[PDB]
């Protein structure tokens, strides 16, 4: 399913490429927005912005501002965030 990952060094320390590499390393890929949304509909809540497919950043809220808070597809892929991975 979908899950949240931080860099070893702590919160908001992964670039887009690093986030993608971390999800791959663990056997998956970055979650898509639709995957993250489906996970949220069945209770997945994390208050931490992360990279996802296509270079979007956001995070899922189940109980408050409900929904995925969208930080958009980021122009600067060297911004440091967490990661949302998909590994079914």
């Amino acid at each position: 399913g979908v899950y949240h990952r931080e860099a070893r060094s702590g919160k908001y320390k992964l670039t887009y490429a690093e986030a993608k590499a971390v999800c791959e390393f663990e056997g998956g890929h970055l979650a898509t927005y639709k995957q993250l949304e489906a996970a949220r509909k069945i209770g997945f809540h994390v208050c931490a912005a992360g990279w996802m497919a296509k270079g979007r950043v956001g995070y899922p809220i189940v109980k408050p501002k409900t929904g995925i808070i969208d930080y958009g597809i980021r122009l600067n892929r060297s911004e440091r965030w967490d990661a949302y991975c998909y590994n079914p």
Side-chain angles (χ1 to χ4, degrees):
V2 174
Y3 63 89
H4 166 255
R5 285 278 178 280
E6 288 188 343
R8 189 209 57 83
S9 52
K11 183 178 194 174
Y12 298 167
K13 270 148 185 297
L14 301 162
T15 63
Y16 177 59
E18 290 174 338
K20 185 160 157 180
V22 169
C23 296
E24 293 173 348
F25 178 61
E26 288 188 357
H29 305 281
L30 288 162
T32 72
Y33 183 91
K34 285 167 169 161
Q35 285 160 357
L36 185 61
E37 171 65 11
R40 194 196 63 80
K41 267 135 155 139
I42 56 170
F44 186 58
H45 180 109
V46 185
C47 195
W51 295 105
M52 74 189 81
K54 289 187 76 214
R56 199 169 297 285
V57 169
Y59 59 96
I61 302 304
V62 170
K63 261 79 185 148
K65 19 176 190 213
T66 76
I68 294 169
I69 303 297
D70 175 35
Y71 283 7
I73 293 164
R74 311 300 303 157
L75 184 96
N76 180 0
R77 302 299 174 75
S78 76
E79 286 179 1
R80 299 167 96 193
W81 295 108
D82 289 340
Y84 285 99
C85 299
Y86 179 61
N87 195 320

